[PDB]
Design a binder for this molecule. Structure first.
Ligand SMILES: [Zn+2]
Length: 241
DNA sequence: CATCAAGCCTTCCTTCAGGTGTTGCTCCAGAAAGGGTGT
C-alpha cells in the first residue's frame, strides 16, 4: 500500500511475466513505480515505445521498469482503470457521478488509490501516490495530479444545498468544468456572486483545483446521492488474465 | 454738387417606406499490441 504498484500484488493479484531480468548492483528506483528495485527483484529494461508521452511523470531516470509497473503498463490494466479507485479489498469504478459522490463524500477508509482519465487511455496509475489518510486524496486526472479533501467537499455541498433551499430551479453558485479545461473552471456565477457571502466566495476560491474538478462531477442539478461503484476487480482481472 | 427713400409680409413641408433569409462550426488532442519491414 506504500507505492501505487502495490495494486499489482496486494490487489489485482498477478505475478511477473518471467521474461524479465533480475536486478544487479546498487538499488535504483523504478522509472514508473517510484519503488526501489532491489537486488533479486524482477525488472525490465525500459522498452517504452515512442507513443509514451508520460516522461514528465517518470519517477527516475533509471530506465528500469519494475515488474509491478510492467503489469501496470498493460493495456487492459490501462483502460480498465480509466475511472477507478483501488482499495485494499478490490477495484471500484468511479465513472458514474454517484460513484464520485461516494468517493468524495464518505470515502472508504482503506489506503486507496484514485485514478481517472481525461482521455480515452493514458498511462495513469503508476504516476500517482497512494492516499494513506482518508481526508487527503491524491487523484490522478489525465496529465495532472489533484488533491481532494472530502470534508471541504461536504462543506461546499452543504453550502450549495443551503443556497438552493426553497427554489424550484436549481442554480449553481460556481461553475466547475468536468474536463477541468474551461477558463471559467473556478469562476463563480453571477447568481452565486449575488447569493454567496464573500467569505463563502473566498472559501470556494480557497479549495484545491482537484476539489473544483471533483465538485464539477458533484455540483450538477440532479444531485448525486453517494453510492458505491460496482466492484470491477474481477472484470479487470479477467481482462488481464 | 449734398440728402431721400436706404422694405414691407408670409411662406418658414407634405407621406410612407421606418428590411427580408441565412448562417446559428468542424476535429483533435491515446497509446499499447499485434502484425509487418528495413537497416
Ligand atoms: Zn516501478
Amino acid at each position: 500500500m506504500r507505492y501505487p504498484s502495490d495494486i499489482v500484488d496486494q490487489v489485482l493479484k498477478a505475478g511477473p511475466d518471467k521474461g524479465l531480468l533480475t536486478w544487479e548492483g546498487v538499488d535504483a528506483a523504478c522509472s514508473h513505480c517510484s519503488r526501489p528495485i532491489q537486488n533479486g527483484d524482477l525488472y525490465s529494461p525500459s522498452s517504452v515505445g515512442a507513443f509514451f508521452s508520460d516522461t514528465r511523470d517518470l519517477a527516475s531516470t533509471s530506465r528500469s521498469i519494475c515488474w509491478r509497473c510492467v503489469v501496470l503498463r498493460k493495456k487492459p490494466m490501462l483502460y480498465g482503470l480509466s475511472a477507478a479507485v483501488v482499495t485494499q479489498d478490490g477495484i471500484y469504478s468511479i465513472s458514474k457521478d454517484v460513484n464520485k459522490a461516494w468517493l468524495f463524500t464518505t470515502p472508504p477508509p482503506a489506503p486507496f488509490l484514485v485514478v481517472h482519465s481525461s482521455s480515452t487511455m493514458q498511462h495513469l496509475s503508476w504516476r500517482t501516490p497512494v492516499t494513506l489518510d482518508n481526508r487527503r486524496i491524491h487523484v490522478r486526472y489525465g496529465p495532472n495530479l489533484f488533491i481532494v479533501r472530502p470534508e471541504v467537499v461536504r462543506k461546499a455541498l452543504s453550502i450549495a444545498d443551503r443556497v438552493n433551499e426553497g427554489q424550484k430551479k436549481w442554480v449553481t453558485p460556481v461553475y466547475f468544468d468536468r474536463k477541468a479545461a474551461a477558463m471559467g473552471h473556478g469562476l463563480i456565477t453571477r447568481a452565486g456572486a449575488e447569493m454567496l457571502t464573500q467569505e463563502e466566495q473566498e472559501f470556494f476560491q480557497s479549495v484545491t483545483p482537484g476539489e473544483r474538478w471533483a465538485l464539477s462531477y458533484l455540483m450538477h442539478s440532479k444531485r448525486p446521492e453517494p453510492e458505491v461503484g460496482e466492484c470491477i476487480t474481477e472484470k479487470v482481472m479477467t481482462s488481464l488474465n
